[PDB]
Amino acid sequence: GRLIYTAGGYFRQSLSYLEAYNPSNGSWLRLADLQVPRSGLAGCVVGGLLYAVGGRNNSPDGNTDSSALDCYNPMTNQWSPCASMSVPRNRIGVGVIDGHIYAVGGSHGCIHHSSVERYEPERDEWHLVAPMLTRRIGVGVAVLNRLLYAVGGFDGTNRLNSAECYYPERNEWRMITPMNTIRSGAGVCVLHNCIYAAGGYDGQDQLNSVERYDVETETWTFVAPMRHHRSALGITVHQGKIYVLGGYDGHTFLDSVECYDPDSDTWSEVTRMTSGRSGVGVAVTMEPC
Ligand SMILES: O=C(O)C[C@@H](c1ccc(Cl)cc1)c1cc[nH]c(=O)c1
16 A cells, blocks of 8 residues: 655744555554755655655754755665755746656745756666756745646745746747635645646745636636635645645644545645645655565
8 A cells, every 4th residue: 555655844834754654544654754954845756766855954053955865765764965965945836747847936045046966776877957047945846747847936136936848859948827825835636637736835824825827718717615724735645635734824834734626626634744734745655564
């Protein structure tokens, strides 16, 4: 069976936790800590391995943006460092295409990146690709039909409803239809033929609204809202359902986990994380041993 892995996050300071939730039985396991605390990171999986990408260590003894890529092997319960990115990227988004990891946007101090780079596991090497048309931190990233999408974020001045698509064989970005809502630090994922954007921050409020982009019609449509307003949430897909983990609602660092059933267009509470946190990295792979 497969588990939902949550890595890092923020509560009072950046966190090192790696914990795994099993939808099939409701259990949480605490696994090997990250070597360096980090919030604002992203998670992804390639070849059954879990990767933690970017972020920032907000700590008593200083604040350090991360260029790190680290690899967790469920078979061994060990973290291993990989090649670092060209630049530190806090509040990063990532997507996987054809076994390669794309790192998108994020911040380094007051620098808000439009740059994008691609990691090749078989070479342990990062290479820059074409930059996005827009600087985006707190950017949502998803992959559909071997195309990469960057959705919302913050450009250093404004939070964004805009979104864009990267065509690998052209090494080019093009704008798509903007969302109906400004969202920085939404959760963005794919399910069936649609890109979903859940929650986020519009500069005033954390959001409970959820909308989805149909690549065939090029239009965004709202679906049922989440039960909890949240920005800086983690999101993933497990067996055809969207799960959202944690985040911030302007009052509380949430422990709430919700899942979305697209067939009934309903959100339900599923479990609580062991402690409230925002800015986690989340992905799905095999249980450890
Ligand atoms: O829009 C912003 O400036 C960044 C945004 C954010 C924070 C964490 C992450 Cl991981 C992703 C996005 C944010 C800021 C303040 N309050 C928010 O609720 C949300």
